[PDB]
Design a protein around this ligand. Structure first.
Ligand SMILES: CCc1ccc([C@H]2C[C@@H](C(F)(F)F)n3ncc(C(=O)NCc4ccc(OC)cc4)c3N2)cc1
Ligand SMILES: CCc1ccc([C@H]2C[C@@H](C(F)(F)F)n3ncc(C(=O)NCc4ccc(OC)cc4)c3N2)cc1
Ligand SMILES: CCc1ccc([C@H]2C[C@@H](C(F)(F)F)n3ncc(C(=O)NCc4ccc(OC)cc4)c3N2)cc1
Lengths: 244, 244, 244
C-alpha cells in the first residue's frame, strides 16, 4: 500500500509512495521495500530502479502513528541486507532530497542518477544522534573523506552538482534517464555484475563498530541533548545543547 | 622483438611494440616487459617511462597464435610483481586507449601522464568475466568508489578529462611530456621514492579474494555466457545472456 | 610565548606565533600547542580554530637554536594524539603554505578553510626523508590516491584550488571565514560531533608501519643522501643523490 512496483521489459521499478511525508520511512514501508527487493528476480528482471514519488527521494524517518515502531531499526537493517545480497544491480533514481535514512538508502543502491534539485544530508549533528559505521565509511568512499568530515561534523548538504563532482552521483538526470540506463545494464552479463557488486560492497565499509564507537554511540543516543533537539524543533526555537 | 628499450640520461623508456593489435598482451610481450623492468637498474636509470607504439597504450589481451597461452595468466602476475617490487618509479605515458589488461598495466604504473584522446575501460560486464580484487581496489582508489561502480557494473569508459578530474591521470600530455617529468623525478632522492612507493602500494589494494569472491569469480569464468559473448562478437550481433 | 590564545563566545582560536620562521615547529611551539589543545575545554568553548601568524600556516620544522631538539619527534607525536583525542572539532584556518610538519598539522585538523594563496606540500623526495604511515594514508584520503602518489613521489605542490577540488579544503576563505563557520559548529550537538570524529579518525589511517616500511624508513633517514641534500641546500646547488 506504500510502494508501487512496475516493470518494462527487464527493468523493475520500485517507487516509494508516501509523498505526504516526503517518503520518510516507517516499518510498513521498510517491510514492503524488503519484500519487493527479494522478489525482484520474479523475474525476468535484470535490473531494478529505486525511486520516490513526488518531490523527495526519502527525507528520513517518520514513525509517527506507526504501530511497529520498536521493530523499525531491525527491519531497516534487514532491508539493507536484502539490497546488499541482491544479485540485481539497483539504480537509484534520486528524484529529490535524500536525508538521513534516505541518504543511507540512496548509498545502498548500486548506482545513482540524481535529479538537478536533489541534495543529500546527514543532519545528525543537529539532532544529537550518531550513525552506524557503514554509513560513515560508505559516505567517505562516495564523497571523499574531506567532504565526509564536513557532512558529518557540520551537517553540510551535498548538492547534485557536487555529488556528480565526487561520484556520489554517477549521472545527473531524471527517473526516465535512470530507467534507460538500467535497460542497458539489463543487457550485460549477470554473473559479471554479481561478482563486481559483491567485491565492491566488500571494500570494508561493512564494519562492526569498535568498542569506543559503541560507547560514544550509546552516550549520544541516550543523551538529554537528543530530547532538547526534539522539543526545540517543536517549539520553533534554536536548541541549547549541553553535551550531555 | 615486441618491445623497444631506449634511454636518455637517467630515464629508461620501455615501449610496447605490437601496434598491429593495439599492443594487446601475449606471453612473449609479457615476458619481455618483465625482463626489461627487472633489468632497468642497469642503470644508471633512476626512472622508467612505460608507453605504447601507435594509437593505443594497450587494448587488452590477444593470445591468438601465441604458443604459451596457458602460461599467460601466471606470467602476467609475475609482471605485476616485478613492477610492484621495482625500486624505480614507473611513469606511464598512456598514449591511447587502455582497456582490460591494459588498464591493469596502466594502474600498476606509479604515475600517469595521459594523452588527450586516451580512455580507460574494464569491459568485463560485456564479456561475462570477473576481475581480481586488486584491479577493483586500485581502480576505486584512483577514480573514486562511485565511478568505479559505474566502470565495473556497466562498462563505463573513463575519458582523459575525467581521469585528470579524479587523479587517475596525474597530467594530460604526451610521451615527451612524460619523459620530461620523469627526468625531474630522476633527480630526486631514490630512497625516499622507494619508501613512499612501498607504503602506497601497501594501502590494502593487494588483497586476497574472499571465499565468496572466488566462488563468484569461478562461476563467471566457467559460464556459458562467456562463450555466448565470444560467438556474438564474431557473428556481429548482440549477445543473449542467461546468467549461467 | 610562541602561541596566542583568544576566545570569542564559544570559539577558541589558537595562533602559531613564529612568523620570523614561517611558523616552523620546534619543541617549545609543539609543547605550547599541546597544552592549549588539552585545556581548550576550559571552556565554555565548543570549537577550536587553529591558524598561523603572517604569511604561512606552518612551513615545516626549524629546530635551530632549540635546546630540546632531541625531544621534538616524541613531543610532536603527543601533539597529534592530543588533537585526535580532543572532543572539540578543530577547524584549521590554513592562511598560507603548509609544508612538511605543517601539512601533517593541517591534516590533523578536523576541517579546513584554506586561503587562496596557500599551498600544501611534502618535499620529502627532495630531502631524502621518509614519512610515517598515517601521513601517507590521511593524505591519500584527502587528495585521492592518484594525487597522493604525485605529492609523495615527486614533491608536487597542492594549490588551494585543487585542495578545494579534492576535499582537502572544505572551503576557500580567510581566518574570519573559519571563525564564523566554527561559531555555527559550536551550536551543534557535542556528542554527535565527538562520535563522528572518533569514527572518522578510526578509518585505518592510524596505521603501524609494516616491517618492510620500517626498514625502508630507517634506510632513508640514515642515508648519506639526507646529508647531501642538506649541504647542497646550504651551498646553493642541486644535490647529487646516490641512493645510499
Ligand atoms: C550487509 C549489508 C549492510 C550494510 C549496512 C548496514 C547498516 C544499515 C544501517 C541502517 F539500517 F540505518 F540503514 N545500520 N544502522 C545500524 C546498523 C548496525 O549494523 N548496527 C549494529 C548492530 C547490528 C545488529 C544488532 O542487533 C541484531 C544491533 C546493532 C546498520 N547497518 C546493514 C547491512
Ligand atoms: C604484488 C603486486 C601485484 C599486484 C596486483 C596483482 C594482480 C594482477 C592481476 C593481473 F595479472 F591480471 F594483472 N591479477 N590477475 C589475477 C590475480 C591474482 O592475484 N589472482 C589470485 C591468484 C594468485 C595466485 C594463483 O596461483 C599462483 C592463482 C590465483 C592478479 N593479481 C599481482 C601482483
Ligand atoms: C593517534 C593520533 C595520531 C595520528 C598520527 C600520528 C603520527 C604523527 C606524525 C608526526 F608526528 F610527524 F606528525 N608521526 N611521525 C612519526 C609517527 C609514528 O607513529 N612513528 C612510529 C613510532 C611510534 C612510537 C615511537 O616511540 C614511542 C617510535 C615510532 C607519527 N604518527 C600520531 C598520532
Amino acid at each position: 500500500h506504500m510502494i508501487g512496483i512496475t516493470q518494462a521489459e527487464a527493468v523493475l521499478t520500485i517507487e516509494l509512495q508516501r509523498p505526504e511525508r516526503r517518503n520518510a520511512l516507517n516499518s510498513q514501508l521498510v517491510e514492503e521495500l524488503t519484500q519487493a527487493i527479494r522478489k525482484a528476480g520474479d523475474g525476468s528482471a535484470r535490473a531494478i530502479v529505486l525511486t520516490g514519488q513526488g518531490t523527495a527521494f526519502c527525507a528520513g524517518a517518520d514513525l509517527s502513528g506507526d504501530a511497529f515502531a520498536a521493530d523499525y531499526p531491525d527491519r531497516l537493517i534487514e532491508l539493507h541486507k536484502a539490497m546488499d545480497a541482491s544479485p540485481m544491480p539497483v539504480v537509484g533514481a534520486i528524484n529529490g532530497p535524500a536525508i538521513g535514512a534516505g541518504l543511507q538508502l540512496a548509498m545502498q543502491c548500486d548506482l545513482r542518477v540524481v535529479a538537478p534539485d536533489a541534495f543529500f544530508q546527514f543532519p545528525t549533528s543537529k539532532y544529537g544522534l550518531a550513525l552506524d559505521n557503514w554509513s560513515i565509511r560508505r559516505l567517505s568512499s562516495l564523497v571523499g573523506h574531506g567532504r565526509a568530515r564536513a557532512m558529518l561534523l557540520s551537517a553540510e548538504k551535498l548538492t547534485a552538482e557536487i555529488a556528480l563532482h565526487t561520484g556520489m552521483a554517477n549521472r545527473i538526470g531524471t527517473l526516465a534517464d535512470a530507467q534507460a540506463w538500467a535497460a542497458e545494464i539489463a543487457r550485460l552479463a549477470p554473473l559479471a555484475i554479481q561478482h563486481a557488486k559483491r567485491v565492491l560492497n566488500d571494500d570494508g565499509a561493512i564494519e562492526e563498530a569498535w568498542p569506543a564507537h559503541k560507547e560514544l554511540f550509546d552516550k549520544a543516543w541516550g543523551s538529554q541533548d537528543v530530547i532538547e533537539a526534539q522539543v526545540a524543533r517543536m517549539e520553533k526555537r534554536p536548541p541549547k545543547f549541553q553535551g550531555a
